[PDB]
Design a protein around this ligand. Structure first.
Ligand SMILES: O=C(O)c1cc(=O)[nH]c(=O)n1[C@@H]1O[C@H](COP(=O)(O)O)[C@@H](O)[C@H]1O
Ligand SMILES: O=C(O)c1cc(=O)[nH]c(=O)n1[C@@H]1O[C@H](COP(=O)(O)O)[C@@H](O)[C@H]1O
Lengths: 256, 256
């Protein structure tokens, strides 16, 4: 098993994955903050304070009450300053012709500011083809959703195998997965795992939590995605540091 | 098999489905226009001219370059005037906690103007639970995506059966399906079928077309969803009338 720094140099590595892996090793962080807030001011204050602790900031631009492209300009300034990627968790899931417009256009112009986006594989490979016609020219990457954290997820068995095949057949654009575990044996592919908290539990709407030690150490994922475990805490900086240290040590102990 | 007018009166019918079925029978239309345009002026001119020909106008609010909630105010005026429902084709596909915010909030406030939305079933029933916590109080309905029109779709076999079970267990909110065919034997549930053109063919990004006669007449669906077959035509009104007459006659001939 290679370090994040060595994976950043693999011959078939995508440039976005390389940039991410380099800054993960430099900063000793494999934490993605899920910045699940409705105010631009809160998003930017979290990005600035937690920037040093995270490899990535995951957005849901469509829950932000005061979205403007200028808010995203301020977020890019912080991402450059503190060295993290921006991941818009849009979960594209339409025919190729539709997702290309949803990615490039409308009010959000997601491709203009998002290093990474993600897509469901259920529509077939046209979803990836459509996205890549916008994303490849704009030097972007995509994650495919191979497994989900929620109760009753149908992303199991043959579905997960289809996501892995799709990623591997579109390696020019697809840089990894949303998954609960290592699903690809190819080290050029990132595994990002949501549904993470230090304590056992869930929410009232089908979310299920596992610990950083379980998902990084035992299940072999690369990055933890954490929302409420940080966002709902009083001291979001110390919460981020707890999750960072947990995920980083789990990674180190798997390397040996 | 019951007429649309008789289905509108079924004991377990959802109010949104009843309203739709009534206006389908009154207007002799089972055509949903996919208004896949980037300009508000074009969306509103299409809604006004084609309103009399359609039972429903399907939007992708996130490809509209000049979206404002006022554009949607003007669309609701036309929907009321010409008697059609508004369907936002958002394809919600996240955990329940996330989709409730995506449905109610952000810039789009989808639940404030959309009669219908749709959701993927891949995350499990939490996607429906989350949406219904916003949609039930706002007297809205939801369609579950049981089958898709695109090449390589994984929405087949056990997946489609899971979508039907989910719909039937959430009939307070779920009014039907996006599907290629009749998937539910319960007549209270609408079947809406995209991937429709009069001529054989496809697009370059995995879309596959079937005719109105095939999907309404042979496959037993209720409503055709048509985008480019109308939108790319020179005379979009005459194109809409051709699709309306095709879908309506296919429906009548299945009734006998
Ligand atoms: O793509 C995602 O990040 C995602 C996939 C998934 O399987 N589960 C999942 O929880 N998510 C997202 O990750 C975040 C989890 O947030 P918390 O449950 O608050 O930690 C939310 O923003 C979800 O939308
Ligand atoms: O939910 C949808 O309407 C949808 C589902 C599906 O399986 N296939 C599909 O084509 N669609 C949508 O229906 C429309 C089809 O447009 P045309 O191919 O131009 O007729 C697009 O807006 C798609 O996003």
């Amino acid at each position: 098993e290679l370090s994040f720094g060595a994976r950043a140099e693999l011959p078939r590595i995508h440039p976005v994955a390389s940039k991410l892996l380099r800054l993960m090793q430099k900063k000793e962080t494999n934490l993605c903050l899920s910045a699940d807030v409705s105010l631009a001011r809160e998003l930017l204050q979290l990005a600035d304070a937690l920037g040093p602790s995270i490899c990535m900031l995951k957005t849901h631009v469509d829950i932000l009450n005061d979205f403007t492209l200028d808010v995203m300009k301020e977020l890019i300034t912080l991402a450059k300053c503190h060295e993290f990627l921006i991941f818009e968790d849009r979960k594209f899931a339409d025919i190729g012709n539709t997702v290309k417009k949803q990615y490039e256009g409308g009010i959000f112009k997601i491709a203009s500011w998002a290093d990474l986006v993600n897509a469901h594989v259920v529509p077939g490979s046209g979803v990836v083809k459509g996205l890549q016609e916008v994303g490849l020219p704009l030097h972007r990457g995509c994650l495919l959703i191979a497994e989900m954290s929620s109760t009753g997820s149908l992303a199991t068995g043959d579905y997960t195998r289809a996501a892995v095949r799709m990623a591997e057949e579109h390696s020019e654009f697809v840089v990894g997965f949303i998954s609960g575990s290592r699903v690809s044996m190819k080290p050029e592919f990132l595994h990002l795992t949501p549904g993470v908290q230090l304590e056992a539990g869930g929410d009232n709407l089908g979310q299920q939590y596992n610990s950083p030690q379980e998902v990084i150490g035992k299940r072999g994922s690369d990055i933890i995605i954490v929302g409420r475990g940080i966002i709902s805490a009083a001291d979001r900086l110390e919460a981020a540091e707890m999750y960072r240290k947990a995920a980083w040590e789990a990674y180190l102990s798997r390397l040996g």
